[PDB]
Amino acid sequence: LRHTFVVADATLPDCPLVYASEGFYAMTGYGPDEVLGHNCRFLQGEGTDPKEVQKIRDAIKKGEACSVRLLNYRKDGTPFWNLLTVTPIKTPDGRVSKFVGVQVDVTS
Ligand SMILES: *[C@@]12=NC3=[C]C([C])=C([C])[C]=C3N([C][C]([O])[C]([O])[C]([O])[C]OP([O])([O])=O)C1=NC(=O)[N]C2=O
């Protein structure tokens, strides 16, 4: 039902976020001044499973949509489960331009 959504700029090497819904900011606890121009890998931490992470990277590198479940931590430290889904956006000539991801706090 509910879920946040963001846009990452693939034209840039590190895939920084260039847009985030109001839910993303509220959920994560960070403000646009702290997220724009960055990679949401900053929401990851100790419990975060590096193997799951390793899957998004590859999907991205390979430029394929992908969904995985990762443990993320809000700005206050409180952790939460993130059911993330990443989708690539290719130009008419096949090249990838942006990446779109939909986050969902499935902490149940
Ligand atoms: C972040 N959501 C998110 C949304 C998009 C559109 C993309 C492309 C990536 C993410 N990430 C994954 C992260 O940026 C990175 O791709 C992986 O960490 C693998 O690369 P590294 O170089 O860091 O090993 C998001 N990850 C999250 O944990 N939370 C989000 O909301």
66 burial level (CB within 10 Å; 0-12, 13-18, 19+) = middle
Gap between the Cα atoms of 65 and 33, Å rounded: 27
Tokens of 99: 């990446």
Distance (angstroms) between ligand 1 centre and the Cα of 92 equals 24
Pocket test for ligand 1, best of 6, 30, 84, 105 (most atoms within 8 A of CB): 84
Q: How far is the CA of 1 from the centre of ligand 1 (A)?
A: 22
Domain spans of the chain? 1-108
Ligand 1 centroid distance, CA of 45 (Å): 12
CATH architecture for the domain at 1-108: 2-Layer Sandwich (3.30)
Task: Tell me, in Å, the resolution of the deposited structure.
Answer: 2.8
Give, for 5, the enclosing helix (H) or strand (E): strand 4-9
Q: How far is CA 78 from CA 23, 37, 43, in A?
A: 17, 23, 11
Q: How was this structure determined?
A: X-ray
